[PDB]
Symmetry: C3
Subunit: 539 residues, 3 copies
């Protein structure tokens, strides 16, 4: 009935129950906020000068942005993580030059695993859903403040890693992307006026440290260097590589051959399913039509077929089951059999979006004169939602391409997000089949599968990683970083990247998305404090 | 395959202090303002050190009629105060809200405390013998400074009796219920059944050293007063400032509650759903059962009903020929003066679509286009029918009013259930007469959230960026001669107009200060304030 | 005046000179005819290694029938992993323990195969139709060498390291209906593995002795509430959990949610599978159901009474020539004719919907029910078992044909989510002495908090000392006093004989982590030439 209740029935040394509480350097932290100086030398540049006899060291840079009230007519929304997308380049410099600098996309890539930093930058239904303005005085977006955590190497080990000011003046320079990049809008929205009236209103905050009798020592800093290859060039080279801690490789789409218009956008909801659902919903109004006689308002190239008694409409080998309840006696159910279609020859394989549907059910509403769709069985993927509208009507297409109504075409959105990777909005599709990295003429690393991305994701505990070669497994700040080292005499002083892209059919519109290869190299530098703060490249 | 150096591929495996851990569970002693207090005495010649306190709570079976559910994270909400003391006095103590604030970034601890559809959805009892809630056990992780560096930070018992005292909040605070639920009986029959668990360490030849502890001190400002002061500040590691609503001027009743689903959208959807039954009515002639002050207008053929400048589009399918569609144009209305601004909830709707069901004699709503916000869902029912209001205010059916819920959660912040609305426009902190810190925007909250990796932080000034346990914490230090020995906080509140019911939600300013103490083990365990 | 430690600067220590490399190797396949992959690691430049990742090429699946992979397919493929040298095994693990060790690692679980593409149950309509496209999954083989990166890495002291992976039969990793030609799939399926690791080329490595925790598993007898781990001398931890045993069944279940794995998803998938047979809109009494079925016409008030249980059924747009019917005994179980009856139809209180004239189907709107996770976890075999006095399964032949074979090897408890805690009391003895006892799972709570996991097990941790840098703290044996074994005794929760889940057989699982010393033997040896 009862049981024995006894404790620990299984029982030069280092003390694990006590430690000597070390007295630290005497200091005082302070959250300091500064207004900048705006310049259009006509790209927007904000400059922040930090010069104080009491600020001995600093870290944890946060940039505030006052987003204005948006008024007028049309559809408008901000890209997710708007604050990060605003950033083109961040530079930290002293009297001796640049101490540390980064491209906007690399800063974003460095913070992509930090949920809190991403939320602060602007990720909400209020900002990211596509809002509509009905009158010229209607408020589309209310004023808002976003916060961008400018992650720097000075944050790694808090005070130990902090940037020390050796009686030197520090300047933080932020270069901004055009407002076109951070905004999703329809043609109805007056962007011309918005672009003229929009001003970047920034404020820089940092944690400053007032230190008594600071004992400065030399340190090491990893400075990222980005190299972008030519359009559709599967190579890129990083020259003068002497001491690198890591190398990252990824693809970016190039939409210069398009008007940057897309059929749909999910808004705040960013899952793969949300992108697909938003796209399906945009097509359904033109796909299944309840009309009195053949539907009007569609191009002559459109092939709208009346749905038979059994509900099955055949588009070649593809069968589409369409069944709508409460259809008026004077009306019939019609299926648009070629809503979007692409073909390079008149008798080639045809990519038809209408063939990607297998079952469509719903109920017609007499009160609203609309079909309310219940269940949709389809094979629409993330690539479909990522096809620019221009690619459906490119010269390579022998067909009209876009057989949608003028109403649907007017609802198309301009998406100019500067940090898109791969060939889709989610970077789901891996389009690199093979990766080869050369240090000089010698093959340093090669792979036929994304094992370097698997390791990057595993080691960094992230789900949005890249093909990365890490040379440094040594703890940061407390140790001098381990690096791949050059041999100038043998010609091993450069990193050459070569990729082999995955293949596709010529009759798929996404085949024509132009790609650029991006190579990121982290070079090791020495931080010295002789005559103010200065950095020296390790060679 | 394709200079003095520190070894990074090998280490000398140090032999640690000889010890044995044990998970120890203890029943307490219950005491009763008649507030429930549980006392747990820890003393054993073999328990040398302890940490990782976990309090278990046996939630009973809930039977009877009416609507009932538990607040999310029920276990944390149960806690009013936790005290850890020896023969020499309090070693460490915390207010229930501060413990919860300290664990808010720990998903596992929050889940263990009681966060499930079984506990947090509002269940209904149909008969006096019907089970509303099944019995359940919740676990509250009592985070203490002794957990930071595991064995290194652990509380050492120097042959002294350690007492863990847990003060409980009244059961009213942890429960969400309607008027039909017999709370009077539940409150009389409810007993807190706690059990304290901890990781005990039997240590052979322990070498105790002096240490430091940060003890939180809380100051609550006078109701609606935008100032609070913390006296005798000599060595503080941090200072936190936040606002709480005070519902003493109300019956603590709210129209809706989302249950287990806790997103901002879930709160809004639950509210919209509760209003829709009285908002759009399919009736044979003018609808009955509504107050005289109700302005229920028949929807015209174009579907548009105008409430001043606001147009509401109403379209219901399958409406019987003998019936018509009606719109309640003043479901909830507020104004301090007649022929002036009106806060009308019916005006917060732009489009309502649905289909009438002949089988259930109800409208099944399809799509709703509205501007209902989190503040609307956070308005107590009492503020709609208050004396300040020139209107009747609550023009809902008796059926809807009967579905209202009592919400007494003790850890609500700001003026809404999600703490979404920032009501602090300016914060000023003074150390003596000198301005230590001032801000407009909540940059101190942004830093708190970044540095503590939490999405629900507070306006916090951190003075200590030194690693804990291994170093003596960095503090803001007093100057008694210069009068710099107190922290004075002044806030400037942003306001929603006087014709907004939420203006009448009273505010409490909360100031939390972490004072540094020395921990010595000379004749028992004792703490000394650093001065 | 006071001596202060510098918190604004540090002396950047120069580390051991090394170079890392991601190395991938193909194995050697062997064939109880269980698949075994062997990977030999021997190099003059590879000094140390860690972070083992196994790749698996999943083939294209063609044909007819319903087919899907279990969530985290890659981990479920693994029966056993062994890392050995010329001196024997260095470290080894059972597949379930590897999975249990990685269950708190979201990234590793995602890489192993967790997607709608893999885990939703796909349907093949023609013998040439593609059910699943080819895919590659990655299994992170977590080892003690990963804890402190380079410091913890496996040092291969001029020896040949062999990584041996034993695979589970493909039946375990696949969910399929009767229509799916499993016989052919099983014959044609081949495990195609590749091992990757992070290798380190180290200049002048200074190897030191270390410690390793090796997991050991003991599975108790079917339905026995006891298990014993013998020869326990230095253990760092002990875990206790339960596994169901489905040997007495055909491993068939009514429903499966696919990729969506929440408790609600399992319940919703089950409710959806039953609704077509539960509420029927028919012209006269419904046909195609067994004679034992009691399908009652729904009255004007909408209330149908099944003993004390009232079911409210209201369907809109029902044709005038048709009526609404309720299957009052869809699934029923009882051991004695006049005793308790477990009836799934009684677990419903309200069903609303609208009949579709276009598709000749009822589209259900709102369902008020008390269906739980246990209901979704009942094998179909128990409803039609010999113990049952009733027919049991009164569903249509259409519904019965949609049943799925689920053979996942890592199921714990008595339900798919391991939600039901069937252990009322736990007692652990070290020899004759009670080492630990608990009623509620406070040891699971501590495991979940300390390891930051939401799917922990009742675990007793003896080591709170930092790993690698310190020799682990252990529970130590006393052979003379008989304290050299860990005996686990549980008190199982009591369930009703008229409840089908009562007949799900249970096995008690006990995991022990034994401490081992890792040494590097160097010496001169002579051999006579022969
Ligand atoms: C489990 O790891 C332990 C290994 C012990 O083994 C030993 C034998 O090997 C190391 C290794 C490989 C290191 O590089 C250490 C290092 O960086 C130190 C301090 C140590 O003690 C280190 C130790 C040894 O003691 N640095 C410093 O002197 C400076 C300039 C700053 C320190 C700041 C704070 C105090 C820490 O950051 C602290 C929050 C915590 O991280 C450590 C104290 C940690 O202890 C614990 C319990 O976590 C160590 C690293």
């Amino acid at each position: 009935p009862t049981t024995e209740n006894l404790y620990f029935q299984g029982a030069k040394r280092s003390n694990v129950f006590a430690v000597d509480s070390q007295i630290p350097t005497l200091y005082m932290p302070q959250y300091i906020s500064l207004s900048g100086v705006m310049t259009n030398d006509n790209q927007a540049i904000a400059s922040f000068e930090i010069r104080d006899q009491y600020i001995t060291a600093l870290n944890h840079l946060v940039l505030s942005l006052e987003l204005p009230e948006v008024k007028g007519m049309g559809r408008f929304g901000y890209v997710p993580y708007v604050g990060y997308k605003c950033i083109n380049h961040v530079s930290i410099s002293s009297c001796n030059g640049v101490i540390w600098e980064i491209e906007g996309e690399e800063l974003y890539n460095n913070c992509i695993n930090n949920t809190i930093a991403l939320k602060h930058s602007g990720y909400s239904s209020e900002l990211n859903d596509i809002s509509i303005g009905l009158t010229p005085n209607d408020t589309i977006k209310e004023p808002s403040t976003v916060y961008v955590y400018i992650k720097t190497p000075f944050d790694v080990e808090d005070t130990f890693s902090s940037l020390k000011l050796s009686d030197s003046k520090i300047t933080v320079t932020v270069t901004f992307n055009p407002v076109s990049d951070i905004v999703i809008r329809d043609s109805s929205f007056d962007f011309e006026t918005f672009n003229k009236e929009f001003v970047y209103v920034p404020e820089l905050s940092f944690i400053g440290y007032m230190v008594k009798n600071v004992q400065i020592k030399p340190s090491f800093i990893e400075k990222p260097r980005r190299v972008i290859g030519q359009i559709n060039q599967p190579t890129a080279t990083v020259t003068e590589v002497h001491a690198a801690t890591s190398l990252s490789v990824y693809t970016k789409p190039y939409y210069g051959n398009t008007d940057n218009k897309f059929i749909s956008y999910p808004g705040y909801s960013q899952d793969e399913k949300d992108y697909i659902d938003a796209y399906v919903s945009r097509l359904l109004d033109d796909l299944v039509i309840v009309s009195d006689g053949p539907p009007t308002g569609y191009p002559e190239s459109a092939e709208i077929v009346e749905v038979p008694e059994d509900g099955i409409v055949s588009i070649q080998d593809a069968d589409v089951y369409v069944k709508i309840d409460n259809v008026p006696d004077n009306m019939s159910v019609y299926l648009h059999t070629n809503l979007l279609m692409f073909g390079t020859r008149k008798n080639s394989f045809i990519y038809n979006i209408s063939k990607k549907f297998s079952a469509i059910t719903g109920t017609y509403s007499d009160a609203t004169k609309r079909t309310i769709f219940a269940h949709i069985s389809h094979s629409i993927n993330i690539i479909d939602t990522s096809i620019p509208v221009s690619l459906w009507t490119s010269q390579r297409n022998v067909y009209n391409g876009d057989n949608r109504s003028a109403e649907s075409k007017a609802k198309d959105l301009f998406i100019n997000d500067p940090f898109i990777k791969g060939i889709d909005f989610k970077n789901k599709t891996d389009i690199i089949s093979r990766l080869e990295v050369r240090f000089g003429n010698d093959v340093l690393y090669s792979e036929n599968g994304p094992i370097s991305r698997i390791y990057n994701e595993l080691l960094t505990k992230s789900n949005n990683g890249t093909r990365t070669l890490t040379f440094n497994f040594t703890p940061k700040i407390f140790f001098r970083p381990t690096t791949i080292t050059a041999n100038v005499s043998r010609g091993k002083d450069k990193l050459s990247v070569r990729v082999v892209y995955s293949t596709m059919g010529v009759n798929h519109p996404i085949y024509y998305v132009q790609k650029q290869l991006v190579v990121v190299c982290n070079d090791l530098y020495k931080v010295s404090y002789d005559q103010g703060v200065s950095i020296t490249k390790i060679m």
